[PDB]
């Protein structure tokens, strides 16, 4: 049920087109998402333990609950699409709305904003 | 299939992209993805699959995403930015760009 890191299975994981890859114990976040930071298009999400196993954090379906379906993400968002220098990116923003007449939702609330830009608090 | 929380519906001709996401338009909340014929199909369109394979994973979602939580009147939300980068080595780079050229802000057109 759980497999550990080696550079084998990681360069099989990192052949996914990084929006299809899928985090776990033996791929991280950082690996298959890229160290957590501040800048614009780089993740802030995960604490060192999401960070460290991915969907296999004890808690992810709380958090999974939230990611959107394809057609909800494309039916959801605001899409665009830039030429840069680097490639051609679809870029994507929107916003998700809890339900805060589930008995959950205070809970629901703490786990998302422990995961929140935790990286600011260790190395 | 509108019985789902918002983020987990998913759109066909029975319950189109209208109907499970609302109206395309320019204000912040709203969407502003499809014509009109990808809003009344949904996933039943048929270049869906080829719209999909730019959808994040649940993981990809959270992995690689700017997320916030922002405390409005109208409640509490999850806020999500990011950018997914197309493969230009893939010989249907060309045909995916035509197919999202389609359906970026396609709505300013419809009569």
Redesign the interface.
């Given at each position: 049920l759980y497999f550990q890191s080696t550079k084998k299975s990681a360069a099989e994981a990192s052949k996914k087109?990084?929006?299809?890859?899928?985090?776990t114990k033996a791929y991280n976040?950082t690996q298959?998402?890229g160290r957590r930071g501040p800048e614009?298009?780089?993740?802030?999400?995960?604490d060192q333990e999401l960070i460290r196993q991915?969907?296999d954090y004890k808690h992810w379906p709380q958090?999974?609950?939230?990611?959107?379906?394809?057609?909800?993400?494309?039916?959801?968002?605001?899409?665009?699409?830039?030429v840069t220098p680097?490639?051609?990116?679809?870029?994507?923003?929107?916003?998700?709305?809890?339900?805060?007449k589930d008995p959950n939702?205070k809970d629901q609330?703490i786990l998302?904003?422990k995961?929140?830009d935790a990286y600011k608090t260790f190395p």
């Open positions: 087109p990084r929006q299809k890859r899928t985090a976040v298959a998402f614009q298009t780089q993740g802030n999400f995960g991915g969907t958090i999974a609950q939230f990611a959107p379906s394809a057609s909800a993400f494309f039916g959801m968002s605001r899409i665009g699409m830039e680097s490639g051609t990116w679809l870029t994507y923003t929107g916003a998700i709305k809890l339900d805060d939702f609330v998302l904003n995961h929140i």
